[PDB]
Amino acid sequence: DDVTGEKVREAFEQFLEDFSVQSTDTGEVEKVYRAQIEFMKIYDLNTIYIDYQHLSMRENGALAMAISEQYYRFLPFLQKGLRRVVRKYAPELLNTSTERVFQISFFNLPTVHRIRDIRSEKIGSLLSISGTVTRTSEVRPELYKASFTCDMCRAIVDNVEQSFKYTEPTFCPNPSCENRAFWTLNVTRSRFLDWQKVRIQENANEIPTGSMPRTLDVILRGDSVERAKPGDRCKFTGVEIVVPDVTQLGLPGVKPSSTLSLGVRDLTYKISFLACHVISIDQEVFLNSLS
Amino acid sequence: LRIIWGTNVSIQECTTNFRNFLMSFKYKFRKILDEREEFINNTTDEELYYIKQLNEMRELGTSNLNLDARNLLAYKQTEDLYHQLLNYPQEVISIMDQTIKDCMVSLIVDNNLDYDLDEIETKFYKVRPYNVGSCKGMRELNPNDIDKLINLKGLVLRSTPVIPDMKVAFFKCNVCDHTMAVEIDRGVIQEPARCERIDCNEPNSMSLIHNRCSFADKQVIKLQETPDFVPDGQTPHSISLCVYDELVDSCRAGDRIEVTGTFRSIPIRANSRQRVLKSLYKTYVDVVHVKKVSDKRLDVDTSTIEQELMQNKVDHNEVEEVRQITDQDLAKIREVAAREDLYSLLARSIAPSIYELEDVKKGILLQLFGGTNKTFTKGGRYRGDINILLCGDPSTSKSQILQYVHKITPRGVYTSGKGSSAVGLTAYITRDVDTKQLVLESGALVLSDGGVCCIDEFDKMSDSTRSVLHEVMEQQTISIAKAGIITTLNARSSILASANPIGSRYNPNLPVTENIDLPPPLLSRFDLVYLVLDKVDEKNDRELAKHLTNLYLEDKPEHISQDDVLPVEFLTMYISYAKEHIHPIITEAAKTELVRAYVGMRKKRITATTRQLESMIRLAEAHAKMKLKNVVELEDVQEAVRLIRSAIKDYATDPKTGKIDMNLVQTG
Amino acid sequence: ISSKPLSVRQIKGDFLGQLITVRGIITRVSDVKPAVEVIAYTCDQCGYEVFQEVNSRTFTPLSECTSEECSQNQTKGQLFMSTRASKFSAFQECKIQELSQQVPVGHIPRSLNIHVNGTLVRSLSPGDIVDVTGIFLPAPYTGFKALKAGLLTETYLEAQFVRQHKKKFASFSLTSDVEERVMELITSGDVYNRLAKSIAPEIY
Numbered sequence A: 001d002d003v004t005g006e007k008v009r010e011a012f013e014q015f016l017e018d019f020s021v022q023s024t025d026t027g028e029v030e031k032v033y034r035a036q037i038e039f040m041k042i043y044d045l046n047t048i049y050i051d052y053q054h055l056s057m058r059e060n061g062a063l064a065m066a067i068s069e070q071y072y073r074f075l076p077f078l079q080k081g082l083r084r085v086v087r088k089y090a091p092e093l094l095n096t097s098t099e100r101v102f103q104i105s106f107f108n109l110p111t112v113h114r115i116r117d118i119r120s121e122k123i124g125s126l127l128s129i130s131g132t133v134t135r136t137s138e139v140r141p142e143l144y145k146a147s148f149t150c151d152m153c154r155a156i157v158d159n160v161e162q163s164f165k166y167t168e169p170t171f172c173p174n175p176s177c178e179n180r181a182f183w184t185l186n187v188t189r190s191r192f193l194d195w196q197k198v199r200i201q202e203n204a205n206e207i208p209t210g211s212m213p214r215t216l217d218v219i220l221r222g223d224s225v226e227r228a229k230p231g232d233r234c235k236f237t238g239v240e241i242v243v244p245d246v247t248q249l250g251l252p253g254v255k256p257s258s259t260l261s262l263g264v265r266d267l268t269y270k271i272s273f274l275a276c277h278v279i280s281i282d283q284e285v286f287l288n289s290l291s
Numbered sequence B: 001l002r003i004i005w006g007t008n009v010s011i012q013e014c015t016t017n018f019r020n021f022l023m024s025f026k027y028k029f030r031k032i033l034d035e036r037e038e039f040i041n042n043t044t045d046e047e048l049y050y051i052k053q054l055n056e057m058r059e060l061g062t063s064n065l066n067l068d069a070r071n072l073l074a075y076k077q078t079e080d081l082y083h084q085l086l087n088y089p090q091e092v093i094s095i096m097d098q099t100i101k102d103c104m105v106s107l108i109v110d111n112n113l114d115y116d117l118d119e120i121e122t123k124f125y126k127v128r129p130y131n132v133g134s135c136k137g138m139r140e141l142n143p144n145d146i147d148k149l150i151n152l153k154g155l156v157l158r159s160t161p162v163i164p165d166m167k168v169a170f171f172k173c174n175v176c177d178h179t180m181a182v183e184i185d186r187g188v189i190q191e192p193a194r195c196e197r198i199d200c201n202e203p204n205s206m207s208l209i210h211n212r213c214s215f216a217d218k219q220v221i222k223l224q225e226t227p228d229f230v231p232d233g234q235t236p237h238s239i240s241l242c243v244y245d246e247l248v249d250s251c252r253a254g255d256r257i258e259v260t261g262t263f264r265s266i267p268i269r270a271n272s273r274q275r276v277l278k279s280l281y282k283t284y285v286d287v288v289h290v291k292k293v294s295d296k297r298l299d300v301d302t303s304t305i306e307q308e309l310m311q312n313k314v315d316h317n318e319v320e321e322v323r324q325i326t327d328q329d330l331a332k333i334r335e336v337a338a339r340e341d342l343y344s345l346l347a348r349s350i351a352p353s354i355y356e357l358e359d360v361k362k363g364i365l366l367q368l369f370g371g372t373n374k375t376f377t378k379g380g381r382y383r384g385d386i387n388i389l390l391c392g393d394p395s396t397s398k399s400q401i402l403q404y405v406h407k408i409t410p411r412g413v414y415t416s417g418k419g420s421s422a423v424g425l426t427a428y429i430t431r432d433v434d435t436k437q438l439v440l441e442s443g444a445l446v447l448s449d450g451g452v453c454c455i456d457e458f459d460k461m462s463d464s465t466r467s468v469l470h471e472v473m474e475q476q477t478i479s480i481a482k483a484g485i486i487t488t489l490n491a492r493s494s495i496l497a498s499a500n501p502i503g504s505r506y507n508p509n510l511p512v513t514e515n516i517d518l519p520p521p522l523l524s525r526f527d528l529v530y531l532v533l534d535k536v537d538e539k540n541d542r543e544l545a546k547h548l549t550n551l552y553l554e555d556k557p558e559h560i561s562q563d564d565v566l567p568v569e570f571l572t573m574y575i576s577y578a579k580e581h582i583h584p585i586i587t588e589a590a591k592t593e594l595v596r597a598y599v600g601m602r603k604k605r606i607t608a609t610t611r612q613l614e615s616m617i618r619l620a621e622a623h624a625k626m627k628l629k630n631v632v633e634l635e636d637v638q639e640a641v642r643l644i645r646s647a648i649k650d651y652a653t654d655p656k657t658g659k660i661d662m663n664l665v666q667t668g
Numbered sequence C: 001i002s003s004k005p006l007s008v009r010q011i012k013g014d015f016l017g018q019l020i021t022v023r024g025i026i027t028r029v030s031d032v033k034p035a036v037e038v039i040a041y042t043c044d045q046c047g048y049e050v051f052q053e054v055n056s057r058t059f060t061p062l063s064e065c066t067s068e069e070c071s072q073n074q075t076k077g078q079l080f081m082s083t084r085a086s087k088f089s090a091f092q093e094c095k096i097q098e099l100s101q102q103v104p105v106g107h108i109p110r111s112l113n114i115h116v117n118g119t120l121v122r123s124l125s126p127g128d129i130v131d132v133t134g135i136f137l138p139a140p141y142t143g144f145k146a147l148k149a150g151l152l153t154e155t156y157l158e159a160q161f162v163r164q165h166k167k168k169f170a171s172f173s174l175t176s177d178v179e180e181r182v183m184e185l186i187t188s189g190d191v192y193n194r195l196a197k198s199i200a201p202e203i204y
């Protein structure tokens, strides 16, 4: 286990629980986060808007630095912390009516880095990227939690959550099996997450002199899917993630490899972006929007 | 003894000799080596060179030391280090890195600086040698020259997106939740079967989590060879450069660079045949140093790379993007600007070999300076590029002028008519051999961004090809909408064009427009249109013949000119400095003069349009920059109008007919 | 038999393995690339250098140190390639072509592959008319497997010596013998007019 991850998770829980600030001149001191929990419970939403400045003011920004610098490891800890917060306050919306996959979509980050400004050191961190939507994919279901039927000692077992790579349960409903031959999925019991791969171009203004617009592929999940418009300037907030690449095998330079009987896997990757918050950069509707 | 097996490198001797060279290097030694005793200046040659440089490097906090090879050559005791580094760059460079760390620690400790030593201790100091011998070409590299530091130079055709490079991998036994750390050794990160600790032992216990791993940045750059010497019947080659760390995104496409790196050969895998390598190795060149700035060419425009400069500062690439100006050199710039015949001197220092084409040489210089790049912060912009057309009789030296401009300019592409196509310029789609996936490259116009695109034999070019010129010609950008690509490309390229009047020889009978034979839209965009005319003048022809013959007197002749001309290095310094610091503005008197000239001009021969006004504005701005002024004055506008009148030979042109009288068309 | 220059058509399967001289034009010459003769692996666990010979277009690397100790002891040493320690050779896959004189009536010229190796590289350029002498060696069949019927062999010519029919201008050295043939021309007198009338004497 990791002590730092659990400690940061409980610190996040505490900071969320005791979040306090004056609300303007009216509303007195409003626990905006704790009240917005039930505000989004009213519609049973699935997003929790974590403004960066809230996380940044407390603990002299140490919590914000920890979250931004190592988001990928901390995210499941934050999920467990949010579940515990729901358990302590406002537990009425936890069940889907299994449990709603609440989305933590950060925003109001300090700076937005361009596609050309993407760097290999900052992978696994949180940032914002601004580009032009050029190609979007379909809303194809993505396997997040799966139900597996064991070829041996046959039965149905759910809650075998899917990882980035395929995962199957080593333990069986009848333990005498302990075999993983043909664990079979089923439609009615597995759980899926909405998925979408959007291709973005570099903006015209930020194009370097004498260079082509570098592109990028961005993954959209949850309620943030099907939000972008082809040809619409949009900003994406999330974490840089690497995905396997089978094209860059003939490129010059040595290649990462493993040894384990060769026991060798050709290891190449290309950088992509998993996004959480995306925004676009009757006359009564327009009037309502009008100040 | 104790040498590394397979090399003559001994750690103790190499470290000692490099330390002695670092402590005891005097630039007077190099000047003696380079036959610069006549040019020696002990006012700065006696001081410790690399010691002062390392003091500056410590003060600034930069982590990269750009070491010169000939510096190692000059100092006698470290002469062998030159060959050792040339033959064994990897181990020798690591040794130099350690020696720099030790010597910097010693320098800090001896001076007894108060700040804590451990704060700066944890930092990798990298030495980036360069200028390691002559180019030698690249096709001549025998396989015995593997892993030897070499010097290459050429154009940068294309650059790949940054590719992450795994160096440290993170495994995790899922049941025991134990994180794993394995480094890289010659490109392999071993998979552990059992766990690192003694918690559990399983055959397939851990799983790789790629995101947790540590990735370094690697970018592949395609360079096209431009050797000084090329064997007969050889087409230009292409070598795949590989860069790392801060050098990522340092080089943009179209940059004539001078790259130093390590020659490398790598086995290549058969297609879909798992883990079978072809015997014939694939050769690629590593990158340690890049020399963008050269004294034979103007510096890269600051305006175009201004946005990228902040990103470079973030990266701290430590590449010399723009050459720095010495203080005494700035004083020399000021005194040269103080000269009375600054204009003639600068004009004639451009293409010194060309004879008696002063008006044309001028226009070329005014193009080289350029107008003010005004930035309308509300929206839109105006660029100070000036485009020149040279429609003239044959054998008038126009192609030579284009060649000289192409050599001088930082990012220029030479093109000749039918050797061009619409898709050939702008941008296109192509398939790389290595990735085997479709990529986008840059045409001549995009590669000429921030420079001059010398377009030769303009008239022979098709009307179809010339159509795309308008977009980059007027608003200095190209917006393509083709199969798969929909975007806008900023091509701030000043077009220089040479053409022959239809008939190949100017017809006195037909007007200027009919001889030039260009559509009014394309013709009007050209700021200056030069009617170079070859007239049979006995005195002028005699002088030209004498000059050309005197060129043939000796094998490597110094140019035969009566008047003194500036060094090309100093001219590049002047032009770069004037372009990048000074941004002139217009005055009320200049405004009135511009309006009056535009009105009087608009009163058959081509009719002046508002493009003529913009050309006058840009020419006045360019002239202001040449004198080093921060404002433009009415005499500069009058000079611009005079240049416009002289380029088309307005005095000798008939007023209403448009025909040219040959008696009055005589020149100097 | 090596003295007689042979056209490409006359290089039948009988001449395989011999030393032959083929006369024809050179059309395509590849760039010089490093070809692996023996590849050297380093196993740091047992401190042994193991060398695997390569004698084909392809090969396969190793996983277990095949030296005595790692194969014998329980220690299983990981071995890594070393390019500098390995053996390479300058290699060029040229391609000679039949001349117009050698082609029979009605046919078209056919080509033969040449594998120039070692220090002999860069001695052949496109458009050259040469008599390359080499060893006519066979190679395993490389085409489609369906067309294969038996142990079919693709053939090449490992170049040994190159003789240029027309010497290059850039390769002139005034050796004493060239000096004498030349001064004999000088002493002939009126070298300009004699050389002028010399070209195409059949034209009056």
Ligand SMILES: Nc1ncnc2c1ncn2[C@@H]1O[C@H](COP(=O)(O)OP(=O)(O)O)[C@@H](O)[C@H]1O
Binding pocket: B353, B354, B355, B356, B357, B393, B394, B395, B396, B397, B398, B399, B400, B401, B544
């Ligand atoms: N005024 C001149 N000054 C210098 N060289 C000249 C001049 N006029 C002709 N030449 C020489 O004659 C040739 C003609 O130049 P070139 O650019 O090839 O002609 P064109 O203008 O037809 O393209 C070149 O070798 C050039 O050096």
Ligand code: BEF
Binding pocket: B392, B393, B394, B395, B396, B398, B399, B499, B500
């Ligand atoms: F005869 Be020239 F190239 F205009």
Ligand SMILES: [Mg+2]
Binding pocket: B398, B399, B456, B457, B498
């Ligand atoms: Mg010409």
Ligand SMILES: [Zn+2]
Binding pocket: A150, A151, A152, A153, A154, A171, A172, A173, A174, A177, A178, A179, A180
């Ligand atoms: Zn089972």
Ligand SMILES: [Zn+2]
Binding pocket: B173, B174, B175, B176, B177, B178, B195, B199, B200, B201, B205
């Ligand atoms: Zn374990």
Ligand SMILES: [Zn+2]
Binding pocket: C043, C044, C045, C046, C047, C048, C065, C066, C067, C069, C070, C076, C077, C078
């Ligand atoms: Zn071994």
